[PDB]
Design a protein around this ligand. Structure first.
Ligand SMILES: Nc1ncnc2c1ncn2[C@@H]1O[C@H](COP(=O)(O)OP(=O)(O)O)[C@@H](O)[C@H]1O
Ligand SMILES: Nc1ncnc2c1ncn2[C@@H]1O[C@H](COP(=O)(O)OP(=O)(O)O)[C@@H](O)[C@H]1O
Ligand SMILES: [Mg+2]
Length: 186
């Protein structure tokens, strides 16, 4: 047994349960969870200049351009709360963001420890998103987000192939939590 100070990526399509498990893992491991969707939504609700520009992209299910997202994650990781590890939820979502992340962490003398892919069939995703009812959880937006995932984000499974663990993310919250912990060796 080696300690809990880890840097974990959760990768997976919209609805895979990433936000859900990131909160549970953050509590268990004693490290913050960081959601790029959450940070954009806060910017939007405080009406920042970033919020104003990001909203067109969030509303449509598109990714916010990478220059804005990379800068935002770089800034968040400057918080001393993230100094002994973190769980990232929804970033990186493209190979460009993965290379940008590598640079950010290298500057700070560290790197990613583990990468968990939340594997969930599309039928399950749809039922979950329809039950969630967030603003972007509509049929046309969900379709776009799925294409976004396939086109931009799914290539990360190959990029992180050496660190990747796939989790059967269909089951109870407790079931999936235990599976994610086994994947982390915890
Ligand atoms: N194991 C699970 N079983 C059933 N529903 C779940 C499970 N995990 C999460 N959910 C629910 O499904 C929806 C999507 O979960 P969420 O964690 O927001 O996914 P993501 O962050 O991957 O888009 C939420 O309404 C959430 O409460
Ligand atoms: N890494 C990212 N790069 C670009 N845009 C992002 C990123 N993360 C989140 N966003 C924007 O925020 C939206 C909501 O993200 P998220 O909360 O992660 O959705 P979900 O919880 O369903 O996985 C995304 O559809 C996108 O418009
Ligand atoms: Mg989420």
């Amino acid at each position: 047994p080696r300690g809990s100070h880890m840097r974990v990526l959760l990768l997976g399509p919209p609805g895979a349960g990433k936000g859900t498990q990131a909160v549970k893992l953050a509590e268990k491991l004693g490290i913050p969870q960081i959601s790029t969707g959450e940070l954009f939504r806060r910017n939007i609700e405080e009406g920042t200049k970033l919020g104003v520009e990001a909203k067109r992209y969030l509303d449509a299910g598109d990714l916010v351009p990478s220059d804005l997202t990379n800068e935002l994650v770089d800034d968040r990781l400057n918080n001393p709360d993230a100094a002994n590890g973190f769980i990232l939820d929804g970033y990186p979502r493209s190979v460009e963001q993965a290379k940008a992340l590598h640079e950010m962490l290298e500057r700070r003398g560290t790197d990613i420890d583990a990468v968990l892919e939340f594997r969930v069939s599309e039928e399950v995703l749809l039922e979950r998103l329809k039950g969630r009812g967030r603003a972007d959880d509509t049929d046309d937006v969900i379709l776009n987000r799925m294409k976004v995932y396939r086109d931009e984000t799914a290539p990360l499974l190959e990029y992180y192939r050496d660190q990747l663990k796939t989790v059967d993310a269909v089951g109870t919250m407790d079931e999936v939590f235990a599976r994610a912990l086994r994947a982390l060796g915890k």
